[PDB]
Amino acid sequence: IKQGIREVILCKDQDGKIGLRLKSIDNGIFVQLVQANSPASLVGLRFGDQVLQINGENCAGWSSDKAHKVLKQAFGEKITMTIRDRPFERTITMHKDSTGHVGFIFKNGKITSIVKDSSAARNGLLTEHNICEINGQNVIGLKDSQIADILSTSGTVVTITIMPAFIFEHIIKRMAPSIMKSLMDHTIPEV
Numbered sequence: 001i002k003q004g005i006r007e008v009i010l011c012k013d014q015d016g017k018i019g020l021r022l023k024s025i026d027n028g029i030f031v032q033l034v035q036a037n038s039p040a041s042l043v044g045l046r047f048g049d050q051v052l053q054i055n056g057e058n059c060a061g062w063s064s065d066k067a068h069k070v071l072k073q074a075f076g077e078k079i080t081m082t083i084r085d086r087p088f089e090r091t092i093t094m095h096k097d098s099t100g101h102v103g104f105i106f107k108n109g110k111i112t113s114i115v116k117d118s119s120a121a122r123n124g125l126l127t128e129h130n131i132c133e134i135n136g137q138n139v140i141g142l143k144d145s146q147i148a149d150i151l152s153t154s155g156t157v158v159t160i161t162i163m164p165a166f167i168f169e170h171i172i173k174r175m176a177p178s179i180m181k182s183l184m185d186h187t188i189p190e191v
Helices: 064-073 144-152 165-171 177-183
Strands: 005-010 020-025 028-034 050-054 079-084 090-095 104-107 110-114 129-134 157-164
Touching (some): 020 064, 020 165, 050 064, 104 144, 129 144, 157 165
Antiparallel strands (some): 020 028, 090 157, 104 110, 110 129
8 A cells, every 4th residue: 555645647438438436435535446448447546546636626525426427527538536545455464374374264355264373363464354455456356266266376475455344345335246246357457
């Protein structure tokens, strides 16, 4: 998680889409969905990011509907957004043991127990937290089996980005799990 704010610049695609859904939280605006192969993913927008401004207008207090309406009505050539990086999230680094385990149990992508004497224990990983990313890869909407598979195919060093469950549950509201699984960007970013 980068500390502080960055400016991103966007162009709508030929269809006039940027590939975002936004959600009002605590009088802020946050990214609920980034679509794969979209201007938004291309410029490195991520689930959980806060949008402070769009074309220099503060988003403070805006409804979801208003944020979307503003985006729809913007001239598509250049859209500037001011972004604070995944403010509700933290990243933890763990080392797999000899058996290839980091030391936790999860269910629906939510951590439910920490294993005694594990790397996850030593690093103070918490329960009641949803897994958002693994080694920088968005894993929101994947089956637990796909998440476990990604953990195995990682090196010895595993970084996890987590979010407190209650906040996660609030961000993903008004969205069917089949949309989240199918449409949320899970690609590794392109250079």
